[PDB]
Amino acid sequence: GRSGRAKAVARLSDLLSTDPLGRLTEVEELLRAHAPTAADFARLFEACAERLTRALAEDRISRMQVTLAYSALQMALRRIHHLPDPQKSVGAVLVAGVPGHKPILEAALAAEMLRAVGWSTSVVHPESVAALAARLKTSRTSTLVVAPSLLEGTEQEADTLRFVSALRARTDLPGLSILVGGRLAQLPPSKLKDSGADAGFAHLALLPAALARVASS
């Protein structure tokens, strides 16, 4: 019940840290019960990721183990949430990772949340800024969501800043709206504007709120 709810983050983190593939059914069971929407899944995943990050920092688990956990989460996600891309759409959006990073689960969750509220969505894990710009132009998409890697280190922040700057430095993407997450979105809001992003989502589950703000202005 709500007892189950209170225990979900701890139970999931344990399962993911020990035998994620062998106990994948239990992982799925917990997420089925406590993640009725992709936004709920995002809240639970991000909480677990903080715990896994700390465990890795204290050497209680290895990067290999985090990799197994992440694969199991991806499998669990696809057993539960897989919305059609909406045909009656409020707009088009592209979710991308930063070159040199693989936010596969985070980008998938971003796409689920955006599809759930009516956005026609595509997802790209681009090789470069140029390749991403090409995809934006071909799909005629003017809104870009940069998916953060919750289980990768702080080098991604400077990488994302260089990424956003590089995008803004171009002249072939006029009017592009850019949303960023992770640590960059957690700064005081005044700092956010300098980076070149139009809005930040401080947690993955706050992405719809951020997109709604950008779409308004």
Binding site: D59, Q87, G153
Partner: protein, 251 residues
């Protein structure tokens, strides 16, 4: 163990570990000790004279500081997984035990090579990426399916082989049967046709589909009470079977 000369001591350490680093109290790499019997790491001498922190990732810097700052002589640290940056910008992991040496408070780092594990990790990440790229292709195809089915003037109904219930259809089929979409989705297909029952109907359509140059089946729709003709086809989707029925007026 008997009495040991310094050169021999160095060689024993260098060959007991897969790789070992001697780092000054200040944090400068003093020596990279190669095990010649272990797969090469390439030239790492360039690390010598440079701060250890130059060759570690940010989380590994913090982890090194965490396990070394309070580390006193007498016992090794807990094992620490550190991620290195190679001179050629290669990134590789080593699991180290740290020892504080009492004579000069240097830290000797005794390593186990994790490169083979990292290689297989990269294969798994690549497969995760490939699966999600294919997932997105399926989403394109699902929209194509939706549009083709809905726009098609050819009346079509899709039925689950397992339950015998309608799983999809288009408006053209709905109009012939005499029902709206939401009422027909989930409905037992046999009960849409007068005189039919699930067992015999499903078996009849399944056998008929499995023949060549089959004739359409005459049915009488329960709702519209219109005489219709049905042509069944059977295919496998996601492990289970679907029955696709094309429906035409008999008159």
């Amino acid at each position: 163990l008997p009495s040991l000369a310094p050169d021999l001591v160095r060689d024993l350490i260098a060959t007991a570990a897969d790789i070992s680093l001697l780092v000054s109290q200040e944090g400068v790499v003093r020596e990279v000790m190669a095990n010649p019997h272990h797969p090469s790491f390439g030239q790492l001498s360039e690390w010598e004279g440079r701060p250890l922190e130059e060759v570690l990732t940010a989380e590994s810097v913090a982890k090194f500081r965490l396990r070394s700052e309070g580390l006193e002589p007498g016992r090794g640290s807990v094992a620490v997984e550190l991620n290195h940056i190679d001179p050629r910008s290669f990134e590789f992991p080593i699991r180290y035990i740290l020892h504080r040496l009492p004579a000069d408070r240097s830290i000797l780092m005794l390593g186990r090579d994790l490169r083979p594990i990292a290689e297989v990790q990269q294969q798994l990440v690549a497969a995760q990426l490939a699966m999600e790229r294919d997932y997105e292709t399926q989403r394109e195809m699902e929209t194509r399916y939706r549009v083709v089915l809905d726009v098609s003037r050819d009346p079509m109904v899709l039925v689950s082989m397992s339950t015998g219930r309608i799983v999809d259809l288009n408006s053209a089929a709905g109009l012939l049967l005499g029902g709206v979409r939401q009422d027909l989705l989930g409905a037992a297909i046999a009960q849409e046709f007068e005189g039919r029952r699930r067992g015999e109907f499903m078996e009849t359509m399944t056998n008929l589909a499995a023949t060549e140059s089959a004739a359409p089946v005459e049915v009488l729709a329960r709702r519209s009470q219109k005489r219709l003709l049905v042509v069944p086809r059977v295919f496998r989707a996601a492990g289970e079977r679907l029955l696709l029925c094309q429906i035409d007026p008999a008159d």
